[PDB]
């Protein structure tokens, strides 16, 4: 009865959305052509949140794909599970952003956003009563940051009473991949403090560190990191689709997690992630999942969680488990290290349990943390910005497209206001 539409913008968002629809369509049991071939009955009663019935038991997803060059669109269409989507949902331009924030928000996005919003409005008219939206992008380039920001603002002015999530990968501390990266990060965060309900922060470096120290891989591609991100997304929204003993949808997590309306930047994680060699040398118990959740080298964002304090923690377990064990262990790991939790909030942890595990696992768990030490990430953006903004370096590519220097000083003041609010509560 509660439906979600999916919008993917950019290159990084397109790859992560492709692996997400492969994972979800494997989980509910449908073929790459769209025919149903499941073995249970519970895979079809709550399918309306992501799919539409179409003319002879074929189910199409509720997805919308947008980019400024046709390369990643045609690359996603040619691959496996590419014949699922409806061909009118592929909207694209011809020009390209050039890793300018301004060329995405002001120059080409102004021509593409009409067709994108027409498709969003038609998919929103076709649904019964929606829970909300979600968007996948990156805070380092021009298509993702600029046009995801533009689409977020238009959707909030049209639909102001829904929940809008964003799954956005952020810039990395040691090594970058674009020279104009902190410019794009600061302007996009200046819009996402205002116009969204919660945002999940992913690094590429912490994903490489999970892939090296825990999974013990020798050759990881981008497919493995997009699979990790898709596993976290499905674990977040699993309480809508399967019946559980104690269940919690998206708005419940909104009400529980954010105390003050501007502190909605989380850090996620998954468990269990084991090797192939040391798989048979451990158990499957709730203490192992809980100790692997509250662990420093497991976090999918490069912020040391013991550099500050925790505001609120959410934990979504999957499988057939016992609730006395769950609640005793949340009590245990909260009084064990009390210095890392906020003093003026008692019993920080929120608990949810769903019955049907991922495909091939006895038990799994998803962690979502709202901590103060994320201020470190924001510090290292802003100072970098000031270095270039002390010299006006690379600036004329942006100033030639329609922006002023007052917008840059506005965005820097906004981000330093946010670092002040983070340092307030610790």
């Amino acid at each position: 009865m509660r439906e979600i539409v999916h919008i993917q913008a950019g290159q990084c968002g397109n790859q992560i959305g492709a692996k997400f629809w492969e994972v979800i369509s494997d989980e509910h049991g449908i073929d790459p052509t769209g025919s149903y071939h499941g073995d249970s009955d519970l895979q079809l009663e709550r399918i309306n949140v992501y799919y539409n019935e179409a003319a002879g038991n074929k189910y199409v997803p509720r997805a919308i794909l947008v980019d400024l060059e046709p390369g990643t669109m045609d690359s996603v269409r040619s691959g496996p599970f590419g014949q699922i989507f409806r061909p009118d949902n592929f909207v694209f331009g011809q020009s390209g952003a050039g890793n300018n924030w301004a060329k995405g928000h002001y120059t080409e996005g102004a021509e593409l956003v009409d067709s994108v919003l027409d498709v969003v409005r038609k998919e929103s008219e076709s649904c019964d009563c929606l829970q909300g939206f979600q968007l996948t992008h990156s805070l380092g380039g021009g298509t993702g940051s600029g046009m995801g920001t533009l689409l977020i603002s238009k959707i909030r002015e049209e639909y102001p009473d829904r929940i809008m999530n964003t799954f956005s990968v952020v810039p990395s501390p040691k090594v970058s991949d674009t020279v104009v990266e902190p410019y794009n990060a600061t302007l996009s965060v200046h819009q996402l403090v205002e116009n969204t309900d919660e945002t999940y922060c992913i690094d590429n470096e912490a994903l490489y560190d999970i892939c090296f120290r825990t999974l013990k891989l020798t050759t990881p591609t981008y497919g493995d990191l997009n699979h990790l991100v898709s596993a976290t997304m499905s674990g977040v929204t699993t309480c809508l689709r399967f019946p559980g003993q104690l269940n919690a949808d998206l708005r419940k997590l909104a009400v529980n997690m954010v105390p003050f309306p501007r502190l909605h930047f989380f850090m996620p994680g998954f468990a269990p992630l084991t090797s192939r060699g040391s798989q048979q040398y451990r158990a499957l118990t709730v203490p192992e999942l809980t100790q692997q959740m509250f662990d420093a080298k497991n976090m999918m964002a490069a912020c040391d969680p013991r550099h500050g304090r925790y505001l609120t923690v959410a934990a979504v377990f999957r499988g057939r488990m016992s609730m006395k064990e769950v609640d005793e262990q949340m009590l245990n790991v909260q009084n064990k290290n009390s210095s890392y939790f906020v003093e003026w909030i008692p019993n920080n942890v929120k608990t949810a349990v769903c019955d049907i595990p991922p495909r091939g696992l006895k038990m799994s768990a998803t962690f979502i943390g709202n901590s103060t030490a994320i201020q470190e990430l924001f510090k290292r953006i802003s100072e970098q910005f000031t270095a270039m903004f002390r010299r006006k370096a690379f600036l004329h590519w942006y100033t030639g497209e329609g922006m002023d220097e007052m917008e840059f000083t506005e965005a820097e003041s906004n981000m330093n206001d946010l670092v002040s609010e983070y340092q307030q509560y610790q």
Binding site: E69, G98, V175, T178, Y208, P220, Q384, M388, F394
Partner: protein
């Protein structure tokens, strides 16, 4: 669905284009008949029934270089209206290319550019090949860049320019042409990659162990670099760039757009059997001064922007590890106002080998582009040469008899002094 138009001017640009179209036909399986027994759309236009004609214009003021193309084994490839010639060369005289002889051609080549650019729908930019030390390669290039920047507006316009060497020189009036064309093209180009003759002579002498290289080996290496730049458009890769991103990453201030290019790994078939060529090895080895294809010292200047383009069998983890262990060393030092100074692109298709050639079969390949403050010193050398031949007014009357006053030389030397003060300003 997204294209590029390449124009070749003068003898050096025509011969580099000969090697480039030989390589591009060898990659995609197209024979020199123009028939193969769809990515090539970005360079070739399909004509009726199994015929792909290139998107190129060849133009020179002297008919002895294009004719070998019109009679040689690529006779059947190009469109015969796209091979335009004149009757008399520029005779190493910049005033004869910009003012007198070069103006009887430009309406024709602008008509051919306009007639090729109406068959496109995703036109992304131009690629103009030329030298510095010559007459039509400087004058006709400057006048064509003026007309293209007036007509085609906000599209990206790149150039591939042969930089004059310190010691090795052929003409006697080279620095005049170099100073005049650097003053004139400074206001219409977006990025111009510099390559040198003497450094490719030393690369072929030491790495490849070739003791007597002709012009063919140099043009094969230049073709490998341009192919590695455009392979992000002709194929499909994990982290891929296009032609518009380069300027946004390498050009901080709108008059510092002279980066220098490098390729790796360049070896023989004798040393290829005794080393494993890891990604960390080629990443550290493109950053050594004995591989830089312009005869300069990168240790005497600090870097402003770098762009690395990988091809073949690479994974991103040791790519980022290799860039990380680059930024820990002390000699490879970056500028203060730029903490993030790397831009990464990764493609899938390996580099192909030309038969009868000199390069070895390898799986991984790196192209590097660097925007640094070392090349200011090279600029200084050129200006000093200008000054000596401006102390006695030598060879000036050949210029001023063809339509150039004696004010332009003082103007152009003024702008070179301005550019030297700009490089030293942003450096110190």
């Amino acid at each position: 669905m997204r294209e590029c138009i390449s124009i070749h001017v003068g003898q050096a640009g025509v011969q580099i284009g000969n090697a480039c179209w030989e390589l591009y036909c060898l990659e995609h399986g197209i024979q020199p008949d123009g028939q193969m027994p769809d990515s090539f759309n970005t360079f070739f236009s399909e004509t009726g029934a199994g015929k792909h004609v290139p998107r190129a214009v060849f133009v020179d003021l002297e008919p002895t270089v294009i004719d070998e193309v019109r009679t040689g084994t690529y006779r059947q490839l190009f469109h015969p209206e796209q091979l335009i010639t004149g009757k008399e060369d520029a005779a190493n005289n910049y005033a004869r290319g910009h003012y007198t002889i070069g103006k009887e051609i430009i309406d024709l080549v602008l008509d051919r550019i306009r007639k090729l650019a109406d068959q496109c729908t995703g036109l992304q930019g131009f690629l103009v090949f030329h030298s510095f030390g010559g007459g039509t390669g400087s004058g006709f290039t400057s006048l064509l860049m003026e007309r293209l920047s007036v007509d085609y507006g906000k599209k990206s316009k790149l150039e591939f320019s042969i930089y004059p060497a310190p010691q090795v020189s052929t003409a006697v009036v080279e620095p005049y042409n170099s100073i005049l064309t650097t003053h004139t093209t400074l206001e219409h180009s977006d990025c111009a990659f510099m390559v040198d003759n003497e450094a490719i002579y030393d690369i072929c002498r030491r790495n490849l162990d070739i003791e007597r290289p002709t012009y063919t080996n140099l043009n094969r290496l230049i073709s490998q670099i341009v192919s590695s730049i455009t392979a992000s458009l002709r194929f499909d890769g994990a982290l891929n760039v296009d032609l518009t991103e380069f300027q946004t990453n390498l050009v901080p201030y709108p008059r510092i757009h002279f980066p220098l290019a490098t390729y790796a790994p360049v070896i023989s078939a004798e040393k290829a059997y005794h080393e494993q060529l890891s990604v960390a090895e080629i990443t550290n080895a493109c950053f050594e001064p004995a591989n830089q294809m312009v005869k300069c010292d990168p240790r005497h200047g600090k870097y402003m922007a770098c762009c690395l383009l990988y091809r073949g069998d690479v994974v991103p983890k040791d790519v980022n590890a290799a860039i990380a262990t680059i930024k820990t060393k002390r000699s490879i030092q970056f500028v203060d106002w730029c903490p993030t100074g790397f831009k990464v692109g990764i493609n899938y298709q390996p580099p192909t080998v030309v038969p009868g050639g000199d390069l070895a079969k390898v799986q991984r390949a790196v192209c590097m582009l660097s925007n640094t403050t070392a090349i200011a010193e090279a600029w200084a050398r050129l200006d000093h040469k200008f000054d000596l031949m401006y102390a006695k007014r030598a060879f000036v009357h050949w210029y001023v008899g063809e339509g150039m006053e004696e004010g332009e030389f003082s103007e152009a030397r003024e702008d070179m002094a301005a550019l030297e003060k700009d490089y030293e300003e942003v450096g110190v």
